[PDB]
Design a binder for these strands. Structure first.
Lengths: 79, 190, 196, 174, 203, 108, 62, 42, 141
RNA sequence: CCAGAACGCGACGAUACUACCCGCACGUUGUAGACGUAUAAGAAUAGGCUCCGGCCUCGUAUCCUAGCAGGCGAUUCCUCCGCCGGCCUCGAAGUGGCCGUCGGUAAUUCGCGUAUUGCAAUUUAGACACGCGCGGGAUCAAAUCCUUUGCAGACGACUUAGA
RNA sequence: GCAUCGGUUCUGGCGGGGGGAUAAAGGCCCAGGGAAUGUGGCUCCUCCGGGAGUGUUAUAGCCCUGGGUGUAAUACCCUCG
């Protein structure tokens, strides 16, 4: 485009009080409406979230798994 | 992620003298001397070995490390230009109106001038002035062929590009009108 | 560009001396009288010094030339003076050229030639205060239009709350400075030729 | 997130007639001070073992200092952070001289690169990489190289900000 | 911190707004400032960004009458720097007008400033402030592209001034050599009590 | 003859009144002392007398030169600017003018 | 139509100026200059050969 | 001399190497051992 | 094959390089942490030049021309001290032109009023001799 | 190409007086503010400077700097400063270099004076501009109204002419 | 204007005490263990500049554990002047 040699009317970054107030009211209304759809949400939600686990690039994941298995064996022996 | 050290190397032939000061590279060989200012790129030049030029960048980003490859190719092409030279062969082909190409050398400016007449029967005379250091000849071995030789690859290729761009067919079907001057071969003089 | 120095001739005519006065008939006519004495004292050393200053410091050289209005039928006796630029050559050549041309008459045919296009620069015919119809060429309003028909109906019908500088208004017409170009010389006729 | 210290915080549920000797829970908390350490302890314990602050008590709070603060070490930090998508794992590495300094650098890095605040970051494990072969990131691998040496190109000299004018143009070579 | 009669600032290599901030604060403090070589001032960022900003400036004009009240677009580099400085000074007060009268700006180095000491401001120097690899342009180049008419004239005058400075620097080197030999020759004939006394005090 | 100077005071400039963004308080003036660039150096000059010296039109009791006297009270900021109190507030036209900071009352 | 500011029109005019109108105006200038030359030819301090001095400000008053 | 053909015709272009700015940080034997350890862990 | 490269030659930061800090003390580099920090130790017997072992920001230090040869990476204070007085770092620092500038600065800072007056008088006497010598040289050529 | 800042600038002509220029004689004259109001390389910043030996973070430098606000007289020194004149030089908004005369001058040392301003009170001190004075040197001008003109014009204004 | 005070307040320096892992470190010793970004040595290549291999201190050093000096010093926090 010929933007450099012939720029157009600038897009003002100066806000107006009316628009700021309207945007604040709309944001509050959206937050309340989202709370309302959340309290009447019929979508299924799991009791326990899917836990990501241990990263592979962690260098001591193998000994941490050894610790987990040892803790399970100790708990089974105690119980 | 900033890389601590990065290095490139340029081998130098035995008959080539390379001088670098303040990132201004001057390469002289059997065919003459080429010069290029590389001060727009941050680089440490050094002599890592007899006949090897080392290029280093310290604490640079991936883009800064990547610019060394372009600098390497540029200096290598300068060395090739002063050692073997660069030659571009162009061919002009026509259907009905024979293209008349006249090559002169201006004594005042020292540059070559190529005049193209009778392109698709047009009455205008097209004139292209070569970059300095580029020599143009009409080949006697083959038919309707120009040969542009020089030390600067950029100059030779841009001169060939100028000759290709000035003979452009406008407002015609190019599936039918095949007339023009085209770069047919690229290589070295030696 | 800046005028550095100006050098004058030794003898100045009365018609060009009239240009420096508003009331020449009452004056003591003292103009350039002290200047003419520096041609005599020190063998014109100040004149030579100013000529050397023009030679070594200046890039543009213009002569001063005046009309001989007494050869015209005009009732005006005060001549017209202007700077005429010397083009061509080096600055030293221009300085020798002008100094050699001091106090000499230059005819029109040693500056211009027949079959040449020139430019003519002049002030146009004055017409005084003129309405918009003849000053700008606007359309006349219909017959018996209220408050005038040689006018513009709307001068500011939109925003801003101002009259814009682009709107046709009544005022001075003519007596404007104009530079017109590409005028062909058909003949340079000689005044001493009885059949010019 | 500040000058952090690492605190060993031990707490328990209040003793009852049913349970005269409750189990003791220990945590390593990176915190600016002891009040924040105890607050974070009760926050994590509420999230894990369902033991509330009102029904529990702090048994001990201690400071864990670095054993060798003058030894350069490589640290691996396994962390989880919460964003608008959800919870994400990261493994990151830091070349520092102490665990607390690695954790401060981690907090600064996470804020700079992912806009994550202190509240959305869960530090799961901080480890010292025992061997040089345990280093997984190239930005630490370039630092643990043999015979490491580099210059400092384009060093702006330190000039006092109260000295407005200078009679010589400064150099950037030393 | 030092109070001077007038500070001559060589504008070459200086960032426009940072130098303008520093100069405007000095002027309001009460210091006289003369900035020379305003054509060699730098603006950070690509050249096309500065050209776009100057064309966006050239858009603005009073609609009903362009000969009054409208933003008058000054194309010279010194006047671009002057506009940047005047934006940081309360110029519509008497104090602001008084502070503006303590400033002089020029293209090139006209005499007698060619034989005066020119200072640099390191807080606005481009080589110290910009990161290597960023782009920057020149106020003189922007001025020439937006309609300043005297780029070549200032170039020729600056070449003459640099030739005369080269002759002056050769004389300065000769004087430095002669002073060094004078100190070396007179070092033998100075009383050693004076010599190691000055050496102990640090001179 | 002697070709040295005679200055026994430190040079300063009157910058401003004590002010917020909008409201100003002429009861206290801000002074920049030459060569003083931090609070440690500004601590040396606390309590030192400072004179604003100006000229009037009438010759009153042998002179046209009038003085306003004051003292340096406390530092200001971190850059060695100091606050000063004068017997009358300094004129608002004197923003940028020079003042003389004496070396007395001395504690050296 | 090609405008008066068109690049092709400018190049055409430049070729006309160089090849056609140029020699004509050069010969006319030679004739006119020859005629006006015909009309025209028809101590250092104390002599003015060394250039001495003639018989608002850029600096602050100081 | 060159025996192979370059596709874009710039036959003077040198035989380039791969752009691996992280080259030389880890050896081959160590990476093989880490491959075995990671496979066992997985 | 003639290659002539006129370029820069910085001082490198590595194990064994001695740094001058802002307080004037010295510190040999033991280990490089990253591109902005090093671990450094100054085991000098001179209290003005000594530095405790710790992290040094490279922005807060300057690269001296002294490098201790074959100082091992990670060496403790005893090994660094043995290498320090083995190499004689204090003497080389004393002949370095940075320490001469620092010594001149301290000498000029410690001067009293009588000291400055005596400086003026002795400098005027030396200046008189130097002026006579300069007149002889300039009159000669 | 058109206008030409009516608070932007340059060159030149003639300049009557109380006008102009020079000297000293001072201001109940004025000034956004003297008090050592000292100091010219250019250029690069992933490179520079050099006396060619070396040197470069650093103006924390260099110059100057003592004497009644700086006296009087010697001892001593040929160093520094200034006014004029000559020859050169300097046009970006014009000024420096060399030489010569004259005047002043602690680099060294000494003799007489300083008091009383009373224990501080701007250290009234610089530069520029303006003005009033003398004593001299130099010079005897224009513009407007008016009459007139019509290349102009509502009126002013403008182009002319009036010895 | 100065001195000696009173009231309020801003700011600088000095001498002590206490705590914690009776700071953690660290220096110098004693006794074990281990490794490489393997020092010396040895072997093999070279552009003769330096690389590659071996392995545990040699013609450098490092890491881990326990003990002594030691109620060490210092940081930080609290506190009396």
């Amino acid at each position: 485009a010929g933007t450099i040699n012939k720029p157009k009317k600038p897009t003002s970054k100066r806000k107006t009080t009316r628009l700021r107030a309207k945007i604040s009211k709309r944001a509050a209304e959206k937050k309340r409406k989202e709370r309302k759809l959340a309290r009447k949400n019929p979508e299924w939600r799991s009791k326990l979230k899917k836990d990501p686990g241990i990263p592979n690039l962690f260098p001591y994941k193998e000994r941490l798994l050894q610790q987990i298995e040892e803790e399970r064996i100790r708990r089974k022996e105690e119980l | 992620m900033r890389y601590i050290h990065s290095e490139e190397t340029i081998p130098v032939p035995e008959n080539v003298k390379v001088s670098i000061k303040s990132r201004l590279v001057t390469v002289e060989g059997p065919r003459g001397k080429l010069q290029k200012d590389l001060s727009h790129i941050a680089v440490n030049f050094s002599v890592v070995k007899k006949g090897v030029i080392g290029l280093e960048i310290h604490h640079g980003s991936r883009k800064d490390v990547a610019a060394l490859r372009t600098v390497r190719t540029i200096i290598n092409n300068m060395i090739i230009g002063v050692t073997k030279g660069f030659k571009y062969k162009m061919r002009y082909v026509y259907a009905h109106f024979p293209i008349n190409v006249n090559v002169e050398k201006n004594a005042e400016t020292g540059c070559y001038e190529v005049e193209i007449r009778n392109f698709i029967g047009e009455k205008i005379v097209r004139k292209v002035v070569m970059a300095p250091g580029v020599e143009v000849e009409i080949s006697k071995a083959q038919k309707d062929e120009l040969i542009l030789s020089g030390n600067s690859l950029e100059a030779v290729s841009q001169s060939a590009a100028d000759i290709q761009q000035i003979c452009k067919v406008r407002n015609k079907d190019i599936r039918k009108f095949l007339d023009g001057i085209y770069v047919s071969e690229k290589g070295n003089i030696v | 560009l800046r005028s550095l120095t100006t050098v004058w001739a030794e003898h100045l005519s009365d018609e060009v001396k009239r240009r420096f006065y508003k009331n020449w008939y009452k004056s003591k006519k003292k103009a350039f009288t002290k200047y003419a004495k520096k041609y005599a004292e020190n063998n014109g050393a100040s004149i030579t010094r100013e000529l050397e200053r023009i030679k070594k410091y200046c890039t543009v050289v213009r002569v001063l030339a005046h009309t001989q209005i007494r050869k015209t039928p005009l009732k005006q006796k005060k001549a017209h003076l202007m700077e005429i630029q010397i083009n061509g050559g080096s600055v030293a050549d221009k300085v020798e050229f002008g100094r050699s041309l001091f106090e000499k008459p230059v005819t029109i045919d040693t500056i211009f030639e027949k079959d040449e296009m020139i430019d003519v620069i002049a002030v146009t015919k004055g017409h005084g205060f003129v309405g918009v119809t003849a000053r700008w060429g606007t359309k006349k309003l219909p017959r018996k239009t209220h408050k005038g028909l040689r006018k513009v109906a709307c001068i500011g019908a939109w925003h801003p709350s101002h009259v814009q500088w682009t709107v046709a208004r009544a005022g001075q017409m003519g007596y404007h400075h104009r530079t017109s170009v590409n005028h062909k010389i058909y003949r340079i006729g000689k005044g001493d030729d009885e059949a010019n | 997130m500040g000058r952090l210290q690492e605190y060993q915080v031990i707490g328990r549920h209040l003793p009852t007639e049913a349970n005269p000797n409750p189990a003791l829970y220990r945590m390593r908390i990176f915190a600016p001070n002891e009040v924040v350490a105890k607050s974070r302890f009760w926050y994590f314990l509420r999230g894990l073992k369902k033991v509330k602050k009102a029904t529990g008590e702090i048994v001990s709070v201690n400071v864990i200092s670095e054993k060798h603060p003058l030894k350069v070490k490589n640290f691996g930090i396994w962390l989880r952070y919460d964003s608008r998508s959800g919870t994400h794992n990261m493994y990151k590495e830091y070349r520092e001289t102490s665990r607390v300094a690695a954790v401060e650098a981690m907090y600064a890095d996470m804020a700079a690169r992912h806009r994550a605040r202190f509240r959305s970051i869960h530090i799961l494990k901080v480890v010292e990489l025992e061997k040089t072969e345990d280093v997984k990131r190239p930005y630490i691998k370039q630092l643990v190289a043999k015979n490491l040496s580099f210059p400092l190109p384009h060093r702006v000299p330190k000039i006092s900000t109260k000295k407005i004018f200078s009679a010589k143009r400064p150099s950037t070579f030393s | 911190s030092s109070f001077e009669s007038v500070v001559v600032i060589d504008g070459k290599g200086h960032l426009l707004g940072r130098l303008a901030s520093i100069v405007a604060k000095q002027l309001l403090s009460g210091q006289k400032i003369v900035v020379v070589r305003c054509e060699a001032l730098n603006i950070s960022g690509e050249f096309f960004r500065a050209k776009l900003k100057y064309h966006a400036y050239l858009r603005k004009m009073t609609r009903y009458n362009p000969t009054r009240g409208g933003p008058f677009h000054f194309r010279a580099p010194s006047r671009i720097f002057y506009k940047a400085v005047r934006g940081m000074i309360p110029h519509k007060t008497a104090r602001g007008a008084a502070a503006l009268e303590r400033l002089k700006v020029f293209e090139g180095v006209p005499p007698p400033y060619d034989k005066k000491k020119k200072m640099v401001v390191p807080q606005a120097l481009r080589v110290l402030r910009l990161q290597p690899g960023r782009k920057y342009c020149t106020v003189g180049r922007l001025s020439h592209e937006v309609g300043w008419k005297y780029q070549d004239v200032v170039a020729r005058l600056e070449e003459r001034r640099k030739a005369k400075g080269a002759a002056y620097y050769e004389r300065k080197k000769l004087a430095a050599r002669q002073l060094s030999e004078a100190k070396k020759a007179a070092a033998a004939k100075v009383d050693p009590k004076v010599s190691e006394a000055l050496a102990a005090y640090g001179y | 003859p002697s070709e040295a100077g005679h200055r026994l005071y430190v040079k300063g400039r009157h910058l401003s009144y004590q002010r917020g963004r909008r409201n100003t308080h002429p009861k206290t003036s801000l002074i920049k002392i030459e060569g003083v660039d931090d609070t440690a150096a500004a601590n040396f000059y606390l309590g030192k007398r400072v004179a604003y010296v100006y000229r009037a039109q009438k010759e009153v009791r042998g002179t046209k030169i009038r003085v306003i006297w004051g003292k340096i009270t406390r530092p200001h900021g971190n850059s060695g600017v100091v606050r000063a109190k004068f017997t009358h507030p300094l004129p608002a036209r004197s923003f940028g003018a020079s003042v003389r900071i004496m070396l007395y009352p001395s504690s050296i | 139509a090609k405008s008066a500011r068109a690049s092709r029109i400018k190049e055409n005019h430049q070729r006309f100026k160089k090849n056609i109108a140029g020699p004509v105006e050069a010969a006319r200038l030679e004739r006119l200059s020859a005629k006006l030359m015909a009309i025209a030819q028809a101590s250092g301090v104390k002599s003015g050969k060394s250039i001495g001095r003639k018989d608002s400000s850029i600096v602050f008053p100081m | 001399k060159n025996l192979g053909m370059r596709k874009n015709g710039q036959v003077w272009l040198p035989a380039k190497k791969a752009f691996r700015p992280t080259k030389g940080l880890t050896s081959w034997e160590l990476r093989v051992k880490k491959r075995q350890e990671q496979a066992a862990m997985k | 094959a003639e290659i002539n490269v006129e370029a820069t030659s910085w001082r490198r930061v590595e194990v064994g390089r001695v740094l001058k800090l802002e307080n004037g003390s010295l510190a040999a580099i033991v280990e490089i942490i990253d591109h902005k920090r090093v671990l450094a130790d100054g085991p000098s017997s001179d209290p003005k030049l000594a530095t405790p072992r710790g992290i040094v920001p490279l922005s807060r230090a300057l690269l001296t021309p002294i490098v201790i040869p074959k100082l091992p990476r990670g060496a403790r204070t005893g090994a660094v001290k043995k290498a320090w007085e083995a190499y004689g770092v204090d003497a080389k620092w004393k002949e370095t032109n940075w320490a001469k500038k620092q010594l001149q600065q301290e000498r000029r800072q410690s001067l009293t009023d009588f000291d400055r007056f005596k400086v003026m008088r002795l400098k005027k006497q030396r200046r008189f001799e130097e002026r006579k010598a300069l007149a002889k040289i300039k009159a000669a050529a």
